[PDB]
Structure 1
Amino acid sequence: CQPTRFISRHNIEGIFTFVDHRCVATVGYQPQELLGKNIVEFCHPEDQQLLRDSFQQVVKLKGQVLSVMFRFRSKNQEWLWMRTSSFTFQNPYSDEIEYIICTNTNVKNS
C-alpha cells in the first residue's frame, strides 16, 4: 500500500510557493488553498514552534534532509500526523536564495 504524500516548495519563512496536486488526497485542500500561506498556519499549536525551528535549521544543514513530525489540519478540520522530509535547494549556477523542498506523508503516530 502506497503512503499518501505530496510535494511542496517553500520559501525560507515557510510560505508554500508550489504545491503538488496530490495534496487533495493527502490533506483535502486544493493547491490554491495552500499556496501563499505559511505551512505553520496548518500546524497544531503544540507543534508550530517545532515546525518553525525546523525550517530555520534546514537551511544550515548543507542540503541534508531534516525530518519533522507534526499535526496538520485537514480540510475537514481534523489533525493528521504528517512526516515532512525537507531539504534546501539553490541552483548552483546562481546566487538565488535557497528554497526548501518538502515531501509530506500522512503517517501513524503509533
Structure 2
Amino acid sequence: CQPTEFISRHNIEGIFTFVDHRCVATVGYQPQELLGKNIVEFCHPEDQQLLRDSFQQVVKLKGQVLSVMFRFRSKNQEWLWMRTSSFTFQNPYSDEIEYIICTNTNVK
C-alpha cells in the first residue's frame, strides 16, 4: 500500500531533480511532471508565498526540518492539504545546500 507521503528532491528554486514514486498515490502527479518544474507552480496561488517564505526559512535553518502546511494541486486540478517537511541537505564540502529534500505528507 502506497502511503500519502513522498520525497520531493528539488533545488532552491523549486525545480525537482528527483521525484518519489508515491507522488502518484499522494497527488496523482507523475514524477516526470515535477521534473524541471517548480513546486510553486502546482501550489495554491494564495499560499504560494507561504511556501516560498518557508522555503527560504528552511535554507536559513539548514538541516532543520520545517514542515509547512499548504494546499497542493492534484492531477484532478483540486487543492489538497499537504504538509511538506522540508529538509535542507548540506554538502560536507563547504556546507552548501545542493538541494532541499521536502517530505510531502498529505494531511487532507
Contact 2:6 2:104 in 1 (8 A): yes
Matched residues, percent identical? 99
C-alpha separation between the residues in 1 aligned to 2:28 and 2:3?
A: 15
Unaligned runs of 5+ in 1: none
Q: Relative to 1, partners in 2 of residues 1:73 and 1:90: Cα closer, same or farther, differing over 3 Å?
A: same
Contact 2:4 2:25 in 1 (8 A): yes
Unaligned runs of 5+ in 2: none
Contact 1:13 1:55 in 2 (8 A): no
C-alpha RMSD of the superposition: 1.8
C-alpha separation between the residues in 1 aligned to 2:83 and 2:18?
A: 18
Q: Relative to 1, partners in 2 of residues 1:9 and 1:50: Cα closer, same or farther, differing over 3 Å?
A: same
Contact 1:54 1:66 in 2 (8 A): yes
Question: What TM-score results when the alignment is normalised by the length of structure 1?
Answer: 0.89
Question: What TM-score results when the alignment is normalised by the length of structure 2?
Answer: 0.90
Shift of 1:91: 2.4
- What is the total number of aligned residue pairs between the two structures? 108
After alignment, is 59-68 or 36-45 more displaced? 59-68
Aligned equivalent of 2:91 = 91
After alignment, is 59-68 or 42-51 more displaced? 59-68
After alignment, is 93-102 or 68-77 more displaced? 93-102
